[PDB]
Subunit: 470 residues, 4 copies
């Protein structure tokens, strides 16, 4: 039961909009909206959506596997060894938000301070003493962005696993000699950094020039979660405000995906006429180039929606019915919809490119969709006893207790996968957790959980106090 | 009773090192060390100190007044109007950590998200609706560092007030015409940005080329807090670890100040021989150029301590008794003392240049000295009823209640000064508060509060949980 | 009779290597090597060649037409109007080395000082007084590289003409309104700068992703000059030194072109066994990325010559027989061939990327191939009377004489084409001429002209004197 | 007889403005204006002057000695050894336009291509074979501006000599160990680069914060050439055009110097009333910050001429009688005087900051003052036989002749000083010569030589032809 199985199971249910039914549903953690900072929904005038992994949640592990396969086949086609074709995606290895160290070829799970929580070289998990050889303070400098790459999105799960597969392969293959910073193959030296760049290039190629989109669109039921409740929620938002779409994707792909997401024999509710996806939006913007979008952006263009090509020239005209925009900046949306940032709730999945940048650069209100939460909640509850033990041990710690804390931390972590919870390693929160708490005003397993709250709901978080104020 | 009066009152007391006396003393908030993240003192192998506003706490308002006076006289000497000589420092206006907006000439108190809490143009406090003309989302982009300058240190209190005095002066003087971005004086236009730069240049000049240091050193009892307990604490730290000094100041000034701080007819305790200040340190480093120090640094130099001049050439030798270093990098300290970052507790007052940068760049443990805490605690306790009311109102808020929340927030804020608490405006925490909580492992009114805790004390903070984990 | 007709006519002749025949041949300007700075051929130890427009001279106007056609079809395919398909390359318009002004959409012919010699907006040649509206000092700032683009190579002849065709089209088409910096089409604005970028992108696409190379290789006799004397010259150079190839092209294309250039039923001379092209070179380097090549370069790679793919990893091994390199830097060649810069004569066609950068960055000796010289010499001689008149007029000028100087300048210029000689407009030398004289030690219509000089020839230029030294 | 002796001898003569006397005077090379590119004086509408080493020519070797002495005393005061006080300026060593190599500590005389003509380490002249160890291609990369510093001005003559004195001192002093990139003194390493930076800093300090200006102004007759013909020439220029002053100097110093330059008991000619220096200028601009002046410049300020301080604010008003400007850009002059660049003849001494940048950035007409020309002409003529021999030898060279060419080159060079002619080493022209020919339209020993030519004089240079055009 993957997180996307949980999501599709919930997707297959019709909405019971009886107000008592809604209150009862949102009791369940799965259907809840979690609150980092208070947000009065009556003050939101524009609801903004991202597409991929927000509206269009790709099914797991099928979509990751497909990405993995195509990225492997691209590497082989440019000259990587044929043994790469023996690799097979394993959803139990990667956790999102890991850092690849391009100097030493390690996947790292770190906290917000750059402290090491987990270190794996290939499939070899390095324990604390051994890690001190490469990380003498058990710490990385996060500002060293040329060395350390943060794998933020669900699109990065395939490369996360592939990176580990490659280090494992070259390490254990007798044709190569391992060195601290890469592999020697005769008179050829491949650094981890250049291997990393090849992988990153190959993922990019698969998305831009390869067959990922085509294979996705030819089997949408296999690859994409579909929910009859989507048009219902959007239709309700449009009753109280404006709705916009802002995607890094191109129009032709957006049209195919959004068409699919709205393909039911009805509109917002059963019995209602079907309406085109575009009718649900006051503004549609593709090729957004987030996060640059939230700074200078790019020139505003108009899509010719018949051909799917951009019209030539910068678009200088007003918001018109049926117009589809490309490029621009966050200021385009604000100006055309007449919103200030705090009037906007932007709903996305990319912690950096959607949430952190819209919050910090523009003061937008933010909702982070965390698809894995669906399953992480089930584990958090089913295994709460292990965490409770860990909490008690940590308290009792103010020895053999310390080795028990390590053992329990490991047993807890393993319940999530080889790289542990997205949110923590035992009692230490991850960088991803700290960025969620800091930048995501709201978060949930799915944006659809907003359907279960009334229009004027006040989401509340407790006021924060400093230690000297308590 | 300024914060420095509180600090000197505590300074005049001898240490009662009876273990029961110590436990009882550190009960009081004034004498307490506050904990943002847990820290096991037994793991600290090096204690590092900054000098100014850490070891050498300048008396208030006398030292700010002196800085103010000299900065005014420098501006007048370069051509500013004679009416500046009518200005007189007012300690009731500035709060630390304000942002000067160089485009519109406002002092702003903001939260961690760039949200406006207070906006003053000269001495005119702008209420929310009027602020929307210049700040349509009631928000600033903190990454716009060319526009917004954060006044982080107690050294910035004089310019904070002076900035306000100048905008007030030019606004109300009929020789000048006010414009949105500065003042017209015939065929001369002075932008707020160029005025700001003149002030910043004049403060720098006063410190580097003017008479501030000379006037300070000629009346140290007037300007500098002195505490017999300093050598006691340092002597105790040296029993369990190494002690270093890292200052942005030059050696000649450092020597005069540190000599004064240790000038008692005894050493660590009464009855003991006096020892030179330098004997308390394993490493002394001046001209540190923090925060660059925590990145590339500068070339390591050796001070000729007889002349106070640098020896010519980069110093390539070992740590030797009596050597005094200049420049270098944080890696100099680590290498010469054989420490990794987590073995170091660095004690400073500059939230950015001491604490944030040593934490983020090097994974040092951090202790922030907040001199105003001495007095902010007295107000926090004496006026807790106003905050309690505010908390209750906010709860009751889930109208005339909303105007009561504004009124109570104001009455609370005014107890601290015209720009409110360093840490908050009513229930909204400031940027400075959020940076203290994030980057300062420990904090206190004075580093001396460490004397009241044993060598192997475990400072504990509660583990943090996400909303879905609670 | 295009310049390439002249070149192929000379190419079809067998080499008469009788020493008296050689001396007599190189009398003719067409077969001569011209000398800007003295060069002792006996000191040259390595001869380096570029491929395109050096060894492989593309036939004119056929190859330019093909590039033009494909670039047009790419623009149409991305959304440019169908009327572009009515354009047809005209070899009589463009001269090499023009500057496109992206702000005002003009093609400019300038001198070394940025002084305007010719200005055309579309096909409208702007006379001096009108040009002062846009160029008040009749001058451009050459350091404004974001505004001004120099069209240096024969590869740029198609876009030179296309730029003019486009400005002409949009200016005279009633669907568009002309503005100073581009064209309005309703709510779309297309700036000259964005049009220019579209053209540049489309040329790049044609070369990298389109069909130019494929269509070239399927009719090499149509598109490429072939000369039986090439292997003879290279074979002779290899007798006295080392020979290398350095191309910006990829290996697969290089192999197809070089195979063709050497496809005769003999080797160096008639009667000799044919040898593969690669046997003529001590070092072969593709994907050179000139001019970056002459600075940091890129990582040195090894080509797998069976597949045409790069081997994975940086190549760290020695120069080996049969190895083909990719990337690297000019230092690669020096190190592997054991040459210092002054031991190298590098033969190329790109005034900036081959000649200026190798001279300035590395102190290489330089030979510039100027394919149009073949025909420019015929005009220079056939019409010397017009220039002679101009010279006399200029002398007599120290009025109606001044209008005669303009008239004669024009009549002279028109003999070369609408944009005049590559080297001058009347008596004013072009930027391209000044760069040839400054950076090209030697130059000629073809590198083959080196066959007509002995191994130890001393090419001499007169020593230069300052005005006060004469 | 220094060049400044020659200049003052000519300065002491009254102007005979009889038209036949003028024609005859300008026959002599000393009194001639030399022409690199033709210039019609009737088209010049604005004459622009620099002050230092243009209008105010400092006497040699007295002024260089003074600069040298003060720079030495500054180095000693910051900690350099006392033996520096034994140094004494020697005018026979430095030639202008040398390059200091900060990596290896050599003074280099180079051509326009970075080819080595002379290399001295301290006072040791390194002959060709030995130089190949450090300069394997006998070449430097001029674009490596962090490594190579060009000593362009007469202000750089003292540091040129001092650099050589220092390398000599540390090399031969047994306290220091010489290394390839600097000197070891125990645990101190001083790199040539850091020594160079100390010298550059000390020269800057002497000019900005030391006593150079004060000592100059207290003995102007000792340090500054004065010429009664200056007001005559300026008065004549003002009859046919506008006259401006643009100096990097401050107003107070400019006023003292310009007052002195005009201090005669008469105005333009004997018998005429004396007029203040400022009356000779339509525009006076100080603190020009050339060459930044010819790009973005700085904010335009107004000088308060009573106090010598800048008025506060950017000056936004018109050109007014008596106004003195500070900062700004070259566009300030153009706009306020209503000139385009080709209407301006700018007269200066700094080949880079005055001449090259005004030519390339703005298309100004340029006149370079070369004070040493006064004496270099006397040597060029007196020793023409040596050059003639060299020319003949070079011809005869197309061996013992080659060693004769080296010997004659040396004997010729030594007539100018240890570092040879400014303009050449034997038959090879220097970088400075090539920049003079390229960027200086006109040049002369003194700007005063313009007095000897009529208002509408056409300065002519021969049209340049390429080798294939001859
Ligand atoms: N999740 C992420 N993915 C990619 N880049 C990131 C992410 N988070 C931060 N960055 C960027 O990485 C760079 C270095 O991060 P650094 O730790 O110095 O800053 P920070 O994110 O502000 O740290 P903190 O989380 O302590 O506020 C910055 O440019 C930052 O914007
Ligand atoms: N006389 C000088 N003094 C200081 N800087 C100079 C001088 N002449 C050129 N430069 C600068 O030095 C840098 C490197 O010079 P480089 O040889 O690459 O360019 P260049 O001067 O254009 O050469 P060329 O003389 O061949 O035209 C450039 O930024 C250039 O402007
Ligand atoms: O790593 C990547 N390389 C290239 N494209 C990516 C990558 N990750 C996501 N994308 C693309 O980004 C788009 C998702 O944009 P979204 O709708 O804004 O979430 C899709 O078109 C993806 O193909
Ligand atoms: O704004 C400033 N301008 C110039 N110097 C400053 C400023 N603020 C602090 N300083 C100097 O910084 C030094 C303080 O360094 P610390 O010991 O590292 O805290 C003192 O020498 C101050 O004079
Ligand atoms: O404008 C261009 N855009 C893209 N490729 C170009 C352009 N001009 C030349 N080239 C390519 O550069 C290569 C020529 O390299 P050369 O052998 O070094 O002259 C050929 O592969 C061309 O296709
Ligand atoms: O190397 C230097 N360092 C500092 N000032 C210099 C240097 N060289 C020249 N100057 C100053 O530049 C000014 C000369 O400007 P000019 O009138 O534009 O030639 C004088 O004030 C000099 O003091
Ligand atoms: Mg997304
Ligand atoms: Mg401090
Ligand atoms: Mg080429
Ligand atoms: Mg000067």
């Amino acid at each position: 039961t993957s997180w996307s199985d949980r999501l599709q199971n919930a997707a297959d249910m019709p909405a019971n909009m009886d107000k008592h039914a809604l209150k009862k549903y949102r009791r369940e953690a799965y259907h809840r909206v979690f609150v980092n900072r208070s947000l009065a929904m009556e003050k939101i005038k524009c609801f903004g959506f991202n597409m991929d992994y927000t509206l269009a949640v790709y099914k797991s592990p099928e979509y990751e596997s497909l990405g993995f396969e195509l990225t492997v086949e691209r590497l082989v086609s440019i000259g990587y060894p044929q043994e790469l074709l023996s690799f097979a995606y394993d959803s139990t290895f990667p956790t999102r938000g890991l850092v690849f160290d391009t100097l030493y070829g390690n996947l790292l799970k770190v906290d917000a301070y750059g402290n090491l929580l987990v270190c794996a070289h290939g499939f070899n998990f390095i324990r604390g003493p051994e890690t001190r050889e490469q990380y003498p303070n058990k710490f990385i400098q996060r500002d060293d962005t040329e060395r350390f790459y943060i794998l933020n999105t669900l699109f990065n799960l395939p490369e996360t696993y592939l990176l580990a597969c490659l280090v494992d392969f070259f390490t254990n293959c007798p044709r190569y000699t391992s060195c601290e910073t890469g592999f020697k193959d005769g008179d050829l030296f491949m650094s981890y950094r250049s291997m990393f760049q090849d992988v990153r290039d190959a993922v990019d190629w698969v998305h831009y020039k390869g067959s990922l989109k085509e294979k996705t669109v030819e089997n949408l039921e296999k690859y994409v979660v579909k929910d009859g409740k989507l048009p219902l929620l959007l239709s309700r938002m449009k009753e109280v405000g404006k709705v916009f779409l802002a995607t890094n994707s191109d129009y032709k792909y957006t049209d195919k995906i959004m068409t699919y997401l709205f393909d039911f024999p009805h509109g917002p509710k059963p019995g209602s006429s079907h309406r085109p996806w575009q009718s649900y939006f006051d503004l549609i913007l593709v090729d957004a180039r987030k996060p640059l979008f939230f700074g200078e952006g790019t020139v505003l263009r108009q899509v010719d929606t018949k051909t799917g090509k951009l019209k030539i020239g910068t678009y200088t005209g007003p918001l018109q019915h049926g117009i589809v925009y490309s490029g621009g900046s966050s200021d385009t949306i604000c100006d055309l919809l007449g919103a200030k940032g705090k009037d906007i709730l932007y709903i996305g999945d990319h912690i950096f490119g959607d949430i952190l940048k819209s919050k910090k650069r523009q003061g937008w209100r933010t909702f982070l969709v965390i698809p894995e939460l669906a399953q992480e909640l089930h584990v958090w509850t089913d295994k709460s006893s292990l965490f409770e033990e860990l909490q008690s041990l940590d308290i009792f710690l103010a020895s053999s207790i310390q080795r028990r804390i390590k053992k329990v931390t490991h047993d807890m972590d393993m319940c999530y996968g080889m790289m542990g919870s997205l949110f923590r390693s035992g009692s230490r929160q991850t960088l991803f957790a700290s960025q969620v708490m800091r930048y995501a005003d709201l978060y949930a397993a799915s944006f659809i959980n907003l359907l279960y709250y009334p229009f004027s709901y006040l989401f509340r978080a407790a006021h924060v106090l400093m230690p000297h104020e308590s």
